[PDB]
Write a protein that binds this DNA or RNA. Structure first.
Ligand SMILES: [Mg+2]
Ligand SMILES: [Mg+2]
Ligand SMILES: [Mg+2]
Ligand SMILES: [Mg+2]
Ligand SMILES: [Mg+2]
Ligand SMILES: [Mg+2]
Ligand SMILES: [Mg+2]
Ligand SMILES: [Mg+2]
Ligand SMILES: [Mg+2]
Ligand SMILES: [Mg+2]
Ligand SMILES: [Mg+2]
Ligand SMILES: [Mg+2]
Ligand SMILES: [Mg+2]
Ligand SMILES: [Mg+2]
Ligand SMILES: [Mg+2]
Ligand SMILES: [Mg+2]
Ligand SMILES: [Mg+2]
Ligand SMILES: [Mg+2]
Ligand SMILES: [Mg+2]
Ligand SMILES: [Mg+2]
Ligand SMILES: [Mg+2]
Ligand SMILES: [Mg+2]
Ligand SMILES: [Mg+2]
Ligand SMILES: [Mg+2]
Ligand SMILES: [Mg+2]
Ligand SMILES: [Mg+2]
Ligand SMILES: [Mg+2]
Ligand SMILES: [Mg+2]
Ligand SMILES: [Mg+2]
Ligand SMILES: [Mg+2]
Ligand SMILES: [Mg+2]
Ligand SMILES: [Mg+2]
Ligand SMILES: [Mg+2]
Ligand SMILES: [Mg+2]
Ligand SMILES: [Mg+2]
Ligand SMILES: [Mg+2]
Ligand SMILES: [Mg+2]
Ligand SMILES: [Mg+2]
Ligand SMILES: [Mg+2]
Ligand SMILES: [Mg+2]
Ligand SMILES: [Mg+2]
Ligand SMILES: [Mg+2]
Ligand SMILES: [Mg+2]
Ligand SMILES: [Mg+2]
Ligand SMILES: [Mg+2]
Ligand SMILES: [Mg+2]
Ligand SMILES: [Mg+2]
Ligand SMILES: [Mg+2]
Ligand SMILES: [Mg+2]
Ligand SMILES: [Mg+2]
Ligand SMILES: [Mg+2]
Ligand SMILES: [Mg+2]
Ligand SMILES: [Mg+2]
Ligand SMILES: [Mg+2]
Ligand SMILES: [Mg+2]
Ligand SMILES: [Mg+2]
Ligand SMILES: [Mg+2]
Ligand SMILES: [Mg+2]
Ligand SMILES: [Mg+2]
Ligand SMILES: [Mg+2]
Ligand SMILES: [Mg+2]
Ligand SMILES: [Zn+2]
Lengths: 127, 206, 83, 155, 23, 97, 97, 60
RNA sequence: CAGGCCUUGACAUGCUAGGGAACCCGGGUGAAAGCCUGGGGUGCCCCGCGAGGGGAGCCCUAGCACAGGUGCUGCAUGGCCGUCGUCAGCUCGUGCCGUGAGGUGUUGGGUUAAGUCCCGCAACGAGCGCAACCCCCGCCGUUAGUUGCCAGCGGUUCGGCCGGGCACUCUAACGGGACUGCCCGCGAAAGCGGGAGGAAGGAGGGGACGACGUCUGGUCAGCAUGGCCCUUACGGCCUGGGCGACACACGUGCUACAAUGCCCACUACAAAGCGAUGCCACCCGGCAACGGGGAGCUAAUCGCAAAAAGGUGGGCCCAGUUCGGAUUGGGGUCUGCAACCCGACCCCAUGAAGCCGGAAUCGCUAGUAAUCGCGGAUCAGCCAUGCCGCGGUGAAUACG
């Protein structure tokens, strides 16, 4: 009756529970659209199931913490796509080719000494 | 002027701290100060003995100082004469229960701080620095080391123009973490000035 | 400025001499190093010599210069201009 | 760079129209990494051009792009003791970049007070063949033809 | 903006509080 | 029946978190297994050279690793036997209830 | 404008003005002298005159050395000229083919 | 003016403001770490030796 | 720097002689330092029912050695660092060639991020570098389950709060994992191009790491150290001043010139850290800075804490303005013995230049740049717009 996946992006972690139904979606105690209200980035989160037509087929209970809304959005995108592969193993094809099943390791590069930021160097006047 | 200290680079990999204990924020400094004063006294007194390492331990109001040395006898004395004398000089300073151990240095010619001090002694005796350095390295390799490198910098032989002389044999892979390399430094005070002596001994890789 | 909850600061050793001169009738010159002391109503009409690091500067206190500090009237830098 | 021909970043298709070209345009609008702002401005503009002229915004946008693409450009090359403006064909990748760049820049030289509006209107003119954006393209091309004589210096 | 004390943004940048940025 | 372990070396910490958890599991009954409390890291950043050369540093850190073990069903069989256990030097123990 | 530094030395406004009249020879080439910077210094062997100047066609960096501070300055000028003349004419070399 | 200063820094002052940390090792008044009682140079010198408990080269 | 003072001296080791030791507490003079001085009881092993007699526990007073010097020399030096340069290099042993400096190897063909590796070769090996071994991050597992978590069932004061559980998240120790290993193709090989599998692919991203040497590089002011120089002073204490000066000139930065913006109000989403004369919930007084109450937290418990950009609404309407927030007036707060020179903060008023910057010039190749805020060391307070970290949002472009 329940289906699960773990999404991570940057510093955001999302626990997502897929349970069949009509499509209601909840993030941390609120509707999807309540929590991501005013964010174009949002509907990208529901993209894995749109790939396998599970759009309206599932309700989703979802936790989210750490990072920021966009990273959280990307985290969700991952987990619910793990949940789908879990809900059906043959879902891998038509999910892996969209690279929805992979986690990007791109995170904040550390601040280095001698620099102003990670790579931004201090301005020098040779002469 | 570049190279990283070969010991600090290997702490908790091939090499272990010399003051092993825990202390909280309010206390750390005071223990550390006493720790260094312990080393201060012992570094002067135990020099003639052949001091290589000085390990220090702490629990609560009690501390155990383990002295590594080439000449254990010069530390202990006659049946415990100096060894007893030490605890009193010690726990006077410490002001607490100061356990003093001694332990053998199995091969002083495989102990880098020892090799270093010996050459420093040799060059305060106006010996031929280059001949000395080749010797030191020859000793360390004979004693079985996988490699050795010894360096002397300063007014060598009294010359006005400072120079650096070194010699090496076998392997000394200072870039390799898992390579065990003992390192030691010795200061040679002369009439014309200070010479620095550095000894690298490659015991083997782990 | 200094908290009103706290005092109106005078170095006591400066102040004491003021009241001493007030009683007997003022005034001799008062050499002080107390730049930090407030001019206080009791000081008015006196002339206090304020050390600026080098010289003691004679300052005749008036009704206008009460609220201030003693240092404010013995400038510490010699500047006559540039070029 | 020196070693190899770098890899063109594949963009993620935009949420509303599913278009890599739209995404690219958004980023060009985007100042200070405020993409939400950037997204609104375009989509707001997409709303406006529909009100003013009832068509498909997507159709307008894409038509405006094809109109600002320089097919030929000049690139300098100092041959001998003089810098010749050599006429060159523009790679399709570069045609795109220049088109989207000029579109936004010309947009933001316009006098009306809101960005979405400027972005709207410029896309309307460029679709019809007017506006500073197309002027840029026309000019770049004219320079190229003007120096057709140096087209053998092409590398 | 960030340089004006009499505004919210200015008090943030400066890391203080007051009428224009209360806690 | 709380035991809180704090050391600068985690090999000698996990060493001792193991042995306390073994000792009271022997003389029973229940040891709540060694929970690894998040580490508090104290960093020191220094200029390598003694004079100028600001843009060149070296990073040093001091890590205090924390462990927690709970002996649930105590039975002073454990309490007395615990009083003598071979604890390394780089570790500090706290017991509370 | 033009900056002059006298490292661990005292000099006069006169001497400073002298240097300015000496650098002035570079005005010959009718090109922009941007932030010329002269550093006067004393070694055991003699004086050292350093200079870094930027121009639309590159930088000039030169060091002059001599027992006589004025000669040291003059040689600095000589080295600077030779550089400036190369900067201003090197491009003309390959006008053909 | 040095040894007199490493001394005057020890004696308690006339006012508690005038107190300031000196490096207990070399007497340095600047860049003195409270936690160690050491300056940045000594901090580095002892740490490289391994004579600072738990302290190690930090890399991430 | 000025002025007021001290002379084995603020500090080490001494040896000698007087005092009493030792430690505390006041008085005078003074800006303070210092000078002056009035207090008060010294254990010991000792002849001690007795004056009395010490020794050295530590001080005091007078000496003599000596101290002390951030005085000079980084061109006498050690140490440590900067730089070329994370560049791919620098050499040695033996043999061979050359009268000799020196060559060879190390060159050559291919290849690599690389003196990387392959093939060839009067060269055959070896070392220091390269790489790897180490740390962080990305997937997964094992072991653990509180102070952390809450899928499901009960209570639910309406808050993971309670029962309960450790699944999940996490936290932090140990492992697994990628090797061009596998298929297609080119290759003499080394490798290169493409594919699949996979969280990850051809060093996965970042870090630590810097060869022989160069710059007679930097530091005698962090420390050490040769030598030269000072000795009622080139040593030492104090009060005050200065290091904050201001016709000018350059370097690094902050905030800006505005509508992709500014202002108000409401409403979300981090990480890493720090915290017992500390971090401060919550309450109340104040427009506020702050003040007075007062709980919690040796802190995965409690606190700093609110992250900001964002989101939702409302105002501004292109103006030197509801842009900008300099300058100055006035009133207060807090730290501190003390904010005149010379602190930070709050409030009222003032509301400058600045309409995007000449010649010239800096950074950055992807979670980068840009932009947004958060922390920490130092620290009574702070002149931090600095520095070292931390996450949020998140591009453009590379023909060559
Ligand atoms: Mg929405
Ligand atoms: Mg960042
Ligand atoms: Mg620089
Ligand atoms: Mg643009
Ligand atoms: Mg244009
Ligand atoms: Mg037209
Ligand atoms: Mg304003
Ligand atoms: Mg800097
Ligand atoms: Mg000048
Ligand atoms: Mg000067
Ligand atoms: Mg001068
Ligand atoms: Mg030079
Ligand atoms: Mg000439
Ligand atoms: Mg020439
Ligand atoms: Mg002096
Ligand atoms: Mg000194
Ligand atoms: Mg202080
Ligand atoms: Mg200090
Ligand atoms: Mg030098
Ligand atoms: Mg040196
Ligand atoms: Mg110098
Ligand atoms: Mg010949
Ligand atoms: Mg021969
Ligand atoms: Mg040869
Ligand atoms: Mg040979
Ligand atoms: Mg070579
Ligand atoms: Mg060669
Ligand atoms: Mg080759
Ligand atoms: Mg490389
Ligand atoms: Mg090799
Ligand atoms: Mg060969
Ligand atoms: Mg993590
Ligand atoms: Mg488990
Ligand atoms: Mg490849
Ligand atoms: Mg390496
Ligand atoms: Mg020099
Ligand atoms: Mg010195
Ligand atoms: Mg010296
Ligand atoms: Mg002599
Ligand atoms: Mg003073
Ligand atoms: Mg001052
Ligand atoms: Mg200054
Ligand atoms: Mg001038
Ligand atoms: Mg200017
Ligand atoms: Mg600044
Ligand atoms: Mg500037
Ligand atoms: Mg305007
Ligand atoms: Mg105005
Ligand atoms: Mg104007
Ligand atoms: Mg205004
Ligand atoms: Mg005022
Ligand atoms: Mg002040
Ligand atoms: Mg500009
Ligand atoms: Mg701008
Ligand atoms: Mg220009
Ligand atoms: Mg790069
Ligand atoms: Mg901004
Ligand atoms: Mg900050
Ligand atoms: Mg702090
Ligand atoms: Mg502070
Ligand atoms: Mg100021
Ligand atoms: Zn120090």
């Amino acid at each position: 009756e329940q289906y699960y996946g773990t999404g991570r992006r940057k510093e955001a972690v999302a626990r997502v529970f897929l349970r069949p139904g009509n499509g209601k979606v909840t993030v941390n105690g609120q509707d999807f659209n309540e929590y991501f209200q005013g964010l174009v980035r949002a509907v990208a989160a529901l993209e894995p199931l749109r790939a396998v037509d599970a759009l309206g087929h599932f309700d989703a209970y979802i936790t989210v913490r750490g990072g920021g809304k966009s990273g959280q959005i990307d985290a969700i995108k991952l987990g619910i796509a793990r949940a789908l592969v879990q809900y059906n193993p043959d879902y891998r094809a038509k999910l892996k080719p969209l690279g929805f099943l992979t986690r990007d390791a791109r995170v904040v590069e550390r601040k280095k000494y001698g620099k102003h930021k990670a790579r931004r160097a201090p301005q020098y006047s040779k002469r | 002027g570049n190279k990283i200290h070969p010991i600090g680079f290997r702490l908790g990999i091939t090499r272990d701290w010399e003051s092993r204990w825990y202390a909280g924020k309010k206390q750390y400094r005071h223990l550390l100060l006493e720790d260094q004063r312990i080393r201060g006294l012992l570094e002067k007194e135990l020099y003639s003995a052949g001091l290589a390492r000085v390990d220090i331990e702490r629990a609560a109001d009690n501390v155990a100082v383990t002295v590594h040395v080439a000449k254990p006898g010069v530390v202990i004395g006659r049946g415990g004469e100096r060894i007893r004398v030490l605890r009193e000089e010690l726990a006077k300073l410490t002001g607490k229960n100061v356990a003093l151990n001694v332990q053998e240095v199995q091969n002083p010619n495989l102990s880098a701080p020892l090799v270093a001090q010996r050459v420093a002694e040799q060059i305060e005796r106006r010996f031929a620095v280059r001949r000395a350095i080749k010797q030191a390295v020859q000793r360390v390799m004979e004693s079985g080391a996988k490699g050795a490198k010894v360096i002397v910098s300063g007014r060598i032989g009294g010359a006005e123009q400072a120079r650096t002389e070194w010699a090496a044999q076998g392997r000394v892979p200072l870039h390799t973490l898992r390579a065990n390399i003992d390192y030691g430094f010795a200061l040679a005070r002369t009439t014309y000035g200070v010479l620095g002596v550095k000894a690298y001994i490659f015991l083997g890789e782990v | 400025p200094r908290s009103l909850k706290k005092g109106v600061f005078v170095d006591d050793h400066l102040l004491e001499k003021v009241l001493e001169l007030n009683a007997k009738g003022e005034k001799r010159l008062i050499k002080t190093w107390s730049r930090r002391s407030t001019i206080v109503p009791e000081m008015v009409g006196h002339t206090i010599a304020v050390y600026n690091g080098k010289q003691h500067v004679p300052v005749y206190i008036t009704e206008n210069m009460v609220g201030h500090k003693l240092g404010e009237f013995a400038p510490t830098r010699t500047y006559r201009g540039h070029g | 760079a020196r070693r190899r021909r770098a890899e063109v970043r594949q963009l993620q298709p935009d949420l509303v129209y599913g278009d890599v070209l739209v995404t690219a345009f958004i980023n060009k609008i985007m100042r200070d990494g405020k993409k939400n702002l950037a997204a609104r401005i375009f989509y707001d503009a997409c709303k406006i051009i529909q009100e003013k002229t009832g068509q498909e915004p997507l159709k307008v946008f894409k038509q405006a792009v094809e109109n600002v693409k320089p097919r030929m450009e000049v690139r300098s090359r100092r041959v001998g003791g003089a810098n010749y403006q050599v006429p060159m064909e523009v790679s399709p990748r570069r045609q795109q970049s220049l088109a989207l760049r000029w579109l936004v820049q010309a947009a933001n030289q316009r006098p009306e007070r809101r960005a979405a509006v400027r972005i709207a209107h410029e896309l309307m003119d460029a679709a019809e063949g007017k506006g500073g954006a197309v002027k840029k393209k026309e000019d770049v091309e004219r320079m190229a033809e003007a120096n057709r004589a140096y087209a053998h210096y092409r590398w | 903006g960030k340089g004006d004390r009499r505004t919210r943004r200015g008090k943030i940048w400066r890391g203080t509080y007051g009428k224009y940025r209360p806690r | 029946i709380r035991i809180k372990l704090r050391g600068f070396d985690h090999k000698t910490l996990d060493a001792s978190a193991q042995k306390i958890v073994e000792a009271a599991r022997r003389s029973g009954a229940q040891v709540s297994g060694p929970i690894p409390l998040p580490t508090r890291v104290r960093r020191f950043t220094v200029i390598r050279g003694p004079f100028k050369h600001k843009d060149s540093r070296e990073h040093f850190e001091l890590r205090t690793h924390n462990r927690l073990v709970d002996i649930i069903n105590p039975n002073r069989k454990t309490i007395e036997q615990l009083m003598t256990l071979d604890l390394p030097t780089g570790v500090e123990i706290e017991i509370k209830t | 404008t033009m900056n002059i530094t006298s490292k661990q030395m005292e000099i006069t406004p006169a001497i400073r003005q002298h240097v300015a009249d000496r650098l002035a020879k570079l005005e010959k080439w009718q090109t922009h002298l941007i932030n010329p910077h002269i550093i006067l210094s004393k070694e055991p062997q003699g004086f050292v005159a350093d200079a870094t100047i930027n121009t639309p066609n590159g930088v000039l960096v030169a060091s002059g050395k001599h027992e006589d501070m004025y000669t040291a300055i003059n040689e600095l000028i000589n080295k600077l000229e030779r550089q400036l003349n190369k900067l201003q004419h090197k491009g003309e070399a390959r006008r053909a083919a | 003016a040095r040894k007199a200063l490493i001394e005057k820094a020890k004696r308690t002052p006339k006012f508690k403001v005038r107190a300031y940390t000196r490096c207990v090792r070399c007497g340095r008044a600047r860049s003195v770490y409270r936690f160690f009682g050491l300056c940045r140079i000594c901090l580095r010198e002892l740490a490289h030796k391994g004579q600072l408990p738990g302290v190690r080269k930090a890399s991430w």
